[PDB]
Amino acid sequence: GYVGLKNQGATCYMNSLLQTLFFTNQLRKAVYMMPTEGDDSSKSVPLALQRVFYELQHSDKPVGTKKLTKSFGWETLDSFMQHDVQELCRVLLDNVENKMKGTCVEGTIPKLFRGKMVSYIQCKEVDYRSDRREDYYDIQLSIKGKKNIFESFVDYVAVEQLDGDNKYDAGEHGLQEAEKGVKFLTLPPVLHLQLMRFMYDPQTDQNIKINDRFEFPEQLPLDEFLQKTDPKDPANYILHAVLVHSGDNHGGHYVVYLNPKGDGKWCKFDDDVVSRCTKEEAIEHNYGGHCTNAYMLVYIRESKLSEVLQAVTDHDIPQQLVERLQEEKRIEAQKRK
Ligand SMILES: O=C(C[C@@H](C(F)F)n1ccc(F)n1)N1CCC(O)(Cn2cnc3c(cnn3-c3ccc(F)cc3)c2=O)CC1
């Protein structure tokens, strides 16, 4: 049923992320609604994303991404090497949130992808506490020395002591013994997790890939990490996508596994070749140990699954957008002949 993206070795994780976003159907529908009719054919990242999405949705042949990469200005070999995957996501989703501003789909990116957490300092021997709320669109999880996603989460919210050299400064009170930590207030409908497999190394001043075993489940209960649970919306997550990489460097092989409709029927998207695969190939096989493994995972909250993955028909694509892309295709085929 699904079509691939053309191979573009220098773009590393880009293709895998494009598919991930394409299959967040509620995002996709919102993308098709952006008022792009006036945009510049070659400078508009919102237009270029609509074009990629349309073509992934209608083309029988593998879809191209050069107009997209031009639009957001990452046209060099090391544009992709100087950035993390989530930084690409931010560049894409921001352009798109901004273009949806003032429209009926304003607020769609925050609604899907944004959560809130509290970061806090608590002094031990005096009453003074500081709470600060931060929003996040993604979470970077540590995997070195952790067996599984559960353990990463426990480490994320684990309390970090501050004393001796590392003491905290409590103004009125003094420098003080304290505890530092984070808790989640909310977890969004679509949860983007990056795994910290690529880490700086001082002993050799260079980033190295860590290929250790790291287990992640199909079904992920996260109530334990919330500051306050909701008994009417339990934080149960369902695995949607597994972004995978083989080898040790930016020359390696990047693929993504998805179960697009949430029903546990999986596929592997390996640039232009899309094929059915087993649940075992998408999940277990990419734990690592034994250089092929996952560096980013997408989960969808169970109570939102129906909404996030609502069907998208061609009726959901304004005809002004169809005509403009179909005219582009007409003229390319014309210069071709
Ligand atoms: O495609 C690559 C490079 C290749 C490597 F082999 F050249 N790579 C493939 C897998 C992997 F982990 N790195 N990357 C895209 C995937 C990547 O962004 C995942 N990632 C994301 N954020 C990280 C990683 C490590 N630390 N952080 C991080 C942590 C906190 C923060 F505020 C910002 C970034 C990380 O490994 C790491 C770099």
Side-chain angles (χ1 to χ4, degrees), residues 1-5 7-60 62-65 67-69 71-76 78-81 83-110 112-115 117-123 125-132 134-143 145-146 148-159 161-165 168-171 173-174 176 178-179 181-182 184-199 201-202 204 208-227 229-231 233-247 249-260 262-264 266-275 277-289 291-318 321-322 324-328 330-331 333-334:
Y2 311 120
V3 53
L5 291 148
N7 185 267
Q8 276 277 226
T11 71
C12 304
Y13 41 74
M14 178 177 70
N15 279 351
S16 302
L17 183 64
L18 288 176
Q19 297 274 198
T20 293
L21 299 173
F22 170 78
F23 283 119
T24 313
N25 298 14
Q26 188 182 184
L27 179 59
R28 197 205 307 171
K29 263 211 261 227
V31 160
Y32 288 151
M33 301 246 265
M34 292 179 296
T36 51
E37 44 265 24
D39 287 12
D40 186 321
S41 223
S42 78
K43 282 169 171 159
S44 185
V45 178
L47 179 62
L49 205 70
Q50 292 175 315
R51 178 184 308 104
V52 167
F53 285 9
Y54 184 80
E55 272 200 302
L56 283 176
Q57 177 162 344
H58 296 265
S59 182
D60 342 286
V63 179
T65 62
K67 303 225 213 162
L68 178 59
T69 51
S71 81
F72 63 80
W74 288 23
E75 294 190 279
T76 63
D78 51 30
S79 289
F80 290 93
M81 297 172 68
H83 297 90
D84 280 305
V85 60
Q86 66 269 19
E87 286 178 312
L88 185 52
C89 202
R90 273 274 73 54
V91 170
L92 296 178
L93 293 190
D94 279 10
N95 268 277
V96 152
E97 175 183 3
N98 288 334
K99 195 64 175 184
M100 292 175 197
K101 279 191 193 161
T103 86
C104 295
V105 286
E106 186 169 349
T108 300
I109 290 359
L112 293 160
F113 297 105
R114 191 163 77 191
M117 73 193 166
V118 236
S119 156
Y120 69 93
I121 300 164
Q122 172 61 64
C123 306
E125 267 140 280
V126 263
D127 196 28
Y128 186 84
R129 187 183 162 104
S130 172
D131 299 303
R132 68 178 210 205
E134 251 103 44
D135 287 345
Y136 64 95
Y137 285 80
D138 45 52
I139 298 161
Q140 289 75 68
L141 287 174
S142 197
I143 67 92
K146 318 283 186 323
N148 58 20
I149 290 283
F150 176 72
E151 284 189 19
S152 284
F153 269 95
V154 165
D155 193 53
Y156 199 88
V157 312
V159 172
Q161 297 299 305
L162 322 164
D163 36 23
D165 259 40
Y168 169 81
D169 173 8
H173 294 295
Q176 289 301 306
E179 315 189 319
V182 209
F184 287 93
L185 294 169
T186 63
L187 288 158
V190 181
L191 187 60
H192 281 188
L193 307 175
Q194 293 78 45
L195 312 181
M196 293 166 48
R197 287 199 175 274
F198 206 41
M199 295 232 93
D201 198 335
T204 191
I208 301 301
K209 204 202 185 190
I210 296 136
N211 289 305
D212 314 339
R213 188 184 177 78
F214 184 79
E215 306 187 346
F216 53 90
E218 179 183 37
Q219 323 219 260
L220 173 57
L222 300 175
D223 265 342
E224 296 167 278
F225 312 102
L226 282 174
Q227 201 181 230
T229 65
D230 187 352
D233 193 358
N236 289 322
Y237 283 79
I238 312 291
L239 182 73
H240 195 228
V242 188
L243 278 81
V244 165
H245 173 275
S246 290
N249 59 62
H250 286 93
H253 192 226
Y254 289 84
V255 317
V256 59
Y257 295 83
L258 283 134
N259 63 135
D263 53 6
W266 295 76
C267 282
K268 180 195 195 177
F269 299 72
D270 180 2
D271 296 318
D272 14 55
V273 175
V274 196
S275 56
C277 72
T278 61
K279 196 190 288 195
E280 299 72 23
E281 191 172 321
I283 298 171
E284 283 56 53
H285 282 207
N286 298 308
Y287 289 175
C291 52
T292 310
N293 41 76
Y295 64 85
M296 165 172 173
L297 306 169
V298 175
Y299 283 91
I300 295 164
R301 195 178 191 119
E302 193 163 3
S303 65
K304 307 286 179 174
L305 195 71
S306 306
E307 200 195 356
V308 169
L309 305 179
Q310 52 189 242
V312 183
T313 68
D314 316 341
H315 311 297
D316 301 322
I317 305 183
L321 184 60
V322 166
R324 183 199 191 148
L325 304 174
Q326 291 176 170
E327 178 70 21
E328 273 170 20
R330 219 236 337 126
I331 286 164
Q334 189 84 44

